[PDB]
């Protein structure tokens, strides 16, 4: 759809300026401390997802920005009669412009007609069609902190407004997510079982193969929630040790579908379980059974979730932010991770992420290795 | 298809609206056995349309009532009364924005 | 069943003795106002039902409560040091004594050893295997404002003697009423999806004209899964087709089973009512449940219309069914109800001991044996 290409920052916090011609791919921008990389991320975030009001925070002169499509947006920064006004113009001619003061006390206020004015103008030009999620390179705080909405005024508390809005999950945030999920999975196919019986009552009223068909669907951990449902399927199975085909047609197919339901609908935690395990060497993550969310050790003991080490909780909140996904940002992915988990992150995440803008920045280049051919040296222009 | 969460809210407030237009509710004293008369009627009764309104998403599982729960072992009237719970939270938000409405019919 | 077989009050409020011999059953008690009726009914549940520490508010000498086995209860009020013991002595059973101002205390802090020692007391003897209800003669009163307050209500105007009140009023049955039609409702419903459950199984289990005609007899609807059998069964295998009219005759059965709780109800009190009917109706929009009174020109009312008379026949059949000491059933009521009140209420509360106390003897039409006539022999 719109991916940014072209980004101009000329003089942003008073001293340096920068110029980044982007791919609608996987863009690994390496650089050491002091390349500016996270706040070009800070500015892509804020014209994404259309909070140009966090752009009075921001000392600059213009930023322009080049979408895939053409469509370019410039923000500058001028001041006029000792009052810092800055416009948002836009490539169609309708350009908004507000005060940095007036801004100031809006932020103050929410903590409003300006914001829907500049919501108001976003949304009559749809600038904020395709959104992106910021991984933020403070994460190991957001486990402090303990999505959340406080976190955002903490963050931007001890590190300037400038900061977007955060939403990104904690190692205790993802514990209760995916129990929901884990109960609302069992609710979802115990309602699939209620209407599999009430469709097939009628159905039923209207060859051995099927009947060892039947006892081999049958012989077959991921039970519905009530678990009148469960006896009924094994008094089945029970019945099955213990012409007419038309019945047993309908049989096979119920067992079948119900079957099928049951893998469906575990489908997105069996995925996000096989991509960290995937990682995770003597070690496995599993959900056996009220629900519980923990860890099997190859000796069979169960342990909790607090028992990972920086590394596997760096992974739970990346891989977990990467299946509820649109432009993904990354800030720093190789907190706390070693050489080879560093050189595997970025494909398995590009296995979770497909189809979408990826811009990573990070420190250690073997993050880079695999898509070597995307690296984007920074270096900025100091003045 | 299925039913969810949404349709039984919507029907509950098409129901207390039309509580509040018969009756003739004029502040919020009526209007707490109101909601409760709205609220009982919107409950599924059929089992499939309990599971996947418990199913779906905007409604917890737990009650934060522990009162409100019946003691009993029987799951599906637990639901059901998880659903009440919720869909008089949920109806206590519009109960307001209700009354100025009516108000502001007449 | 420890039913009461003769009761004898002495000096009570320090004014007269008084010696009633009970029968098993229906204890029709007749004598004008005056003469301690209700003292007599509240002395007895305030016995039966255990609950002693209401003798601390009474003024009496020597009770003695003789129950049908032969179990002994005497109760005296003794002062020795300017202060009332109460003595609770039990035939071959341990003796409990407490002071009255301690009582007095204990009941005051409500406004607890005593009431262990008194649960502990009842608890270890077994005094309360039976239990006697109470209704009370000014049940207009619970109608004015089941309920908890009434009893400290009632309590306040007529002293601490007055045993536990648990009495419905109207606008109140009216909740009842409707709370169980919607769990009737309520479990009509659940069984439809238990029967599906069930006869899944059933027809996996199991694998003449007759029983196809009687299935399409006895198919209706009350979703429509039914009507789509009835189609089907309109356009070997004989076991399916038995577990499906078992399963539909048995469906028809809990539906008739599920109302005929409240239908007993409607027909008790349809059967004295006169050119109007008590009955419950669903809306045809949001299927809720109406319950109230339905004139023979199909026009609905509230239950509110109803006038003294109906409510009192409404207080008294609910209550009844729901379950003994009947205060007062003559209040507003016309000669010919009074006339068959007990003929109606004698086939739905059988079986146990009923004391009624009235001051009409119109009451006691059809059973004149057993008219006990009260008399105080005042000191
Ligand atoms: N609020 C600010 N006001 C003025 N100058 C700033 C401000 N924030 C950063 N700078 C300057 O810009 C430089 C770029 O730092 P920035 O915050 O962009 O991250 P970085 O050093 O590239 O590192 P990382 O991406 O790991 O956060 C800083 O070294 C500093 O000189
Ligand atoms: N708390 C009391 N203290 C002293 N005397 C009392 C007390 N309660 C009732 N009495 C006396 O008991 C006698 C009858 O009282 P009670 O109201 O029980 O009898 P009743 O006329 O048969 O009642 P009812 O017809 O309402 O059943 C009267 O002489 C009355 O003064």
């Given at each position: 759809i719109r991916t940014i290409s072209k980004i101009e920052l000329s003089k942003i916090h008073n001293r340096y300026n920068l110029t980044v011609d982007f791919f609608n791919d996987l863009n690994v921008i390496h650089g050491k401390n002091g390349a500016g990389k996270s706040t070009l991320i800070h500015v892509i975030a804020n014209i994404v997802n259309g909070?140009?009001?966090?752009?009075?925070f921001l000392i600059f002169e213009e930023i322009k920005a080049t979408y895939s499509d053409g469509l370019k947006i410039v923000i500058r920064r001028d001041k006029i009669d000792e009052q810092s006004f800055i416009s948002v113009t836009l490539s169609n001619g309708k350009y908004i412009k507000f005060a940095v003061g007036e801004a100031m006390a809006t932020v103050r206020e929410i903590e409003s007609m300006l914001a829907m004015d500049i919501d108001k103008f976003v949304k009559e030009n749809e600038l904020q069609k395709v959104r992106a999620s910021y991984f933020p390179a403070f994460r190991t705080m957001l486990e402090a902190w303990?999505?959340?909405?406080?976190a955002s005024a903490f963050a931007r508390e001890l590190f300037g407004q400038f900061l977007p809005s955060i939403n990104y999950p904690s190692p205790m945030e993802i514990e209760d997510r995916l129990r929901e999920e884990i109960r609302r999975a069992q609710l979802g196919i115990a309602a699939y079982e209620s209407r599999t019986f009430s469709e097939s009552f009628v159905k039923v009223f209207s060859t051995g193969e099927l009947l060892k068909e039947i006892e081999g669907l049958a012989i077959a951990i991921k039970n519905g929630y009530y678990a009148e449902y469960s006896k009924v399927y094994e008094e089945i199975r029970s019945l099955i040790n213990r012409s007419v085909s038309g019945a047993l047609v309908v049989y096979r197919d119920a067992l079948r579908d119900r079957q099928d339901y049951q893998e469906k609908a575990f489908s997105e935690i069996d995925n996000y379980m096989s991509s960290v395990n995937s990682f995770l060497e003597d070690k496995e993550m599993a959900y056996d059974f009220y629900p519980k969310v923990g860890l099997k050790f190859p000796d069979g003991s169960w342990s909790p979730?607090?028992?990972?080490?920086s590394g596997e909780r760096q992974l739970l909140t990346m891989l977990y932010a990467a299946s509820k996904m649109a432009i993904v940002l990354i800030d720093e992915?190789?907190?706390?991770?070693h050489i080879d988990w560093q050189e595997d992150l970025l494909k398995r995440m590009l296995s979770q992420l497909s189809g979408r803008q990826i811009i990573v920045c990070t420190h250690?280049?073997?993050?880079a290795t695999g898509y070597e051919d995307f690296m984007i040296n920074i270096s900025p222009e100091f003045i | 298809s299925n039913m969810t969460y949404n349709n039984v809210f919507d029907h509950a407030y098409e129901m207390l609206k039309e509580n509040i237009r018969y009756?003739?509710?004029?502040?919020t004293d009526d209007l707490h056995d109101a909601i409760h008369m709205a609220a009982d009627n919107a409950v599924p009764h059929y089992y499939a349309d309990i599971f996947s309104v418990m199913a779906s998403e905007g409604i917890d599982l737990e009650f934060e009532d522990s009162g409100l729960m019946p003691d009993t072992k029987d799951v599906i009237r637990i639901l059901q009364a998880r659903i009440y719970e919720q869909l008089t939270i949920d109806l206590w938000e519009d109960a307001e924005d209700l009354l100025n409405e009516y108000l502001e019919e007449v």
């Amino acid at each position: 759809i719109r991916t940014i290409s072209k980004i101009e920052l000329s003089k942003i916090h008073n001293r340096y300026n920068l110029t980044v011609d982007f791919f609608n791919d996987l863009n690994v921008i390496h650089g050491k401390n002091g390349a500016g990389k996270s706040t070009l991320i800070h500015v892509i975030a804020n014209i994404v997802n259309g909070d140009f009001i966090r752009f009075a925070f921001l000392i600059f002169e213009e930023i322009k920005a080049t979408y895939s499509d053409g469509l370019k947006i410039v923000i500058r920064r001028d001041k006029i009669d000792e009052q810092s006004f800055i416009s948002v113009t836009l490539s169609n001619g309708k350009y908004i412009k507000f005060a940095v003061g007036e801004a100031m006390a809006t932020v103050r206020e929410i903590e409003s007609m300006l914001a829907m004015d500049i919501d108001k103008f976003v949304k009559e030009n749809e600038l904020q069609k395709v959104r992106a999620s910021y991984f933020p390179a403070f994460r190991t705080m957001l486990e402090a902190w303990s999505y959340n909405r406080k976190a955002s005024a903490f963050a931007r508390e001890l590190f300037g407004q400038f900061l977007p809005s955060i939403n990104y999950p904690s190692p205790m945030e993802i514990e209760d997510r995916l129990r929901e999920e884990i109960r609302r999975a069992q609710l979802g196919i115990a309602a699939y079982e209620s209407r599999t019986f009430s469709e097939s009552f009628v159905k039923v009223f209207s060859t051995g193969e099927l009947l060892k068909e039947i006892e081999g669907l049958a012989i077959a951990i991921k039970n519905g929630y009530y678990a009148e449902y469960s006896k009924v399927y094994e008094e089945i199975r029970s019945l099955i040790n213990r012409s007419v085909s038309g019945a047993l047609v309908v049989y096979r197919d119920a067992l079948r579908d119900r079957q099928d339901y049951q893998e469906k609908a575990f489908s997105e935690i069996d995925n996000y379980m096989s991509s960290v395990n995937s990682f995770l060497e003597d070690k496995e993550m599993a959900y056996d059974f009220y629900p519980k969310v923990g860890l099997k050790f190859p000796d069979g003991s169960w342990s909790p979730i607090r028992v990972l080490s920086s590394g596997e909780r760096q992974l739970l909140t990346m891989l977990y932010a990467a299946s509820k996904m649109a432009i993904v940002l990354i800030d720093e992915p190789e907190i706390s991770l070693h050489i080879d988990w560093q050189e595997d992150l970025l494909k398995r995440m590009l296995s979770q992420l497909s189809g979408r803008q990826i811009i990573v920045c990070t420190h250690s280049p073997s993050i880079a290795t695999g898509y070597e051919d995307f690296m984007i040296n920074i270096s900025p222009e100091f003045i | 298809s299925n039913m969810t969460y949404n349709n039984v809210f919507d029907h509950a407030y098409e129901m207390l609206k039309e509580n509040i237009r018969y009756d003739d509710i004029r502040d919020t004293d009526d209007l707490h056995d109101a909601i409760h008369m709205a609220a009982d009627n919107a409950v599924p009764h059929y089992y499939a349309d309990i599971f996947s309104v418990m199913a779906s998403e905007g409604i917890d599982l737990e009650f934060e009532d522990s009162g409100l729960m019946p003691d009993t072992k029987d799951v599906i009237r637990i639901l059901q009364a998880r659903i009440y719970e919720q869909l008089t939270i949920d109806l206590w938000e519009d109960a307001e924005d209700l009354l100025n409405e009516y108000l502001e019919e007449v």
